[PDB]
Amino acid sequence: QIQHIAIVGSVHGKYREMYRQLSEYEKSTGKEISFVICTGDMQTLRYEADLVYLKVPPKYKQMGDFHLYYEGKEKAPYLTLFIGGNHESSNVLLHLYNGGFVCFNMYYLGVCSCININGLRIVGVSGIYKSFDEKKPYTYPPSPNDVVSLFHTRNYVIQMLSNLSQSSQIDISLSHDWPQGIVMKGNYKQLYRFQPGFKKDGASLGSPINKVILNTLKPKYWISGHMHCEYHAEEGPTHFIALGKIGYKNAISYLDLPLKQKTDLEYDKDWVCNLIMTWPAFSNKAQFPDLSYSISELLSKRTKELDKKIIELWEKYIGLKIIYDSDTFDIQFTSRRFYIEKIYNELNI
Ligand SMILES: [Mn+2]
C-alpha cells in the first residue's frame, strides 16, 4: 500500500498547465495522486489589484491562472499544499501567515508550520534568504511599500521549527531556495555544466536559514524549487530534491511513499503547541514578531500537561482537521489570531 505524492517546483501562476500535467500522470500510469506539494512562486493573485504585491520583472507582471480557481471557474483536482516563494501575491500570504486555504484544495502552510497528512509530517519554510531582512519584523496590514521585503525568510522560523523532531521524525520539508551548502553534496559538476551561473556562489549557494533547519530536523526529504533545474543530493539521512519551473520537464516529480493510514489534512500537534506558546511574541497585530521576546525561552515553557491542554483547547475552538474556509483573508488573519490568543490566555501563565 503506497501513496503517490506529486512534488512541484515553481508554478509562476500556471495552474491549469500544472494540473493538466498532473492528470496526464494518473492516466499515463494509472497511478493515483494522494496529494500535491508545491515549493513556491505560486502567484496567488485574486484580482488585478493584487498585481501591486507581486514583485517580478516587468515582463512577468501577469495575472496568471490563480484567479480562475479563486472565482470557482476552475477547480483544483488534487489537494494542493504549498509554501511561498519570491514571486507571490505577498499581501494574501501575509494575511495567511498562520496558514490557510487560498481557495478550494489549495492550502498555504504560512510563513512556516508543520502539518499532518496520511501519517506524514510535513514542514514548510516560505520565502527566500536575504541577510538584510532576516531580522525585519512583519508589519500589518500589508503595504505596497513592502512588496520587496515581504517574501524574505526571517531568522525566527529557525526557533519556531527547531524542536519539531523531538517526538517523531519529519517526513518531508519544503523550502523555496536551497539549503546553503547542499549543492556540493550531489553531482554539482553535472549541475554546473548545465547551470554555469551557479559555480560562482560555490558552497554559499542557497539559504543559511534552510541549512540550519535541515541539519536540525534531518527530514527524510527536503524539497526545494526556485533554481530552474532538476537536482538530487544527499546530506546524511536527508534526500534533497530540487525542481524546475512549470512549463518545463524538470518541474514535476513524484514520491511513492508507504501509506500506513489514509488521513485527512490535519494541524500538527507540536506545531500547534509552539504556535500557542509563542503568542506573546505575536500579540501586536501591527508588528510581529516582537523579538524582545526569546522564541526559545517561550518554547522552553512547553510541558506535557500543558501541551495536552493546548491540543484539547485547539480541538474545541478550531478543530484538528484543516478545513476549507471561504472567509476573506483579512477575516481569517483576525480569526486565527483571536483563537490563538484565547487558548494562550486560558492556560493561565
Ligand atoms: Mn523563485
Author numbering: 5 to 353
Article passage:
The spliceosome excises introns from nascent messenger RNA (1) in the form of a lariat containing an unusual 2′,5′-phosphodiester linkage (2). Sequence analyses predict Dbr1 consists of an N-terminal domain belonging to the metallophosphoesterase (MPE) superfamily of enzymes and a C-terminal domain (CTD) lacking detectible sequence similarity to any other class of protein.
The α pocket cysteine of Dbr1 was substituted to serine to prevent hydrolysis of larger RNA substrate analogs, such as AK65, a synthetic, linear RNA that possesses the 2′ phosphate at the conserved branchpoint adenosine but lacks the 2′ nucleotide that would be present in the complete lariat branchpoint. The structure of the AK65•Dbr1(C14S) complex shows that the enzyme engages the branchpoint nucleotide in a C2′-endo conformation that, in concert with stacking of the adenine base between His16 and Tyr64, places the pseudo-equatorial 2′ phosphate adjacent to the metal binding center and within hydrogen bonding distance of Asn90 and His91. There are few sequence-specific protein-RNA interactions at the branchpoint, consistent with the need for Dbr1 to hydrolyze lariat RNAs containing atypical branchpoint nucleotides. However, a pyrimidine is predicted to be suboptimal for aromatic stacking with His16 and Tyr64, consistent with the reduced activity observed toward cytidine branchpoints. Conversely, substitution by guanosine could promote tighter binding of the branchpoint nucleotide through hydrogen bonding interactions between N1 and N2 and the side chain of Gln47. The structure also demonstrates that the LRL element unique to Dbr1 enzymes acts as a recognition module, with five of its residues (Ile132, Lys134, Phe136, Phe155 and His156) engaging the single-stranded arm 3′ to the branchpoint adenosine. The interactions between RNA and the LRL are stabilized by secondary contacts between the LRL and the CTD involving residues 141–144 and 290–293, respectively. In the other three AK65•Dbr1 complexes in the asymmetric unit, the 5′ nucleotide is disordered and not visible in the electron density maps.
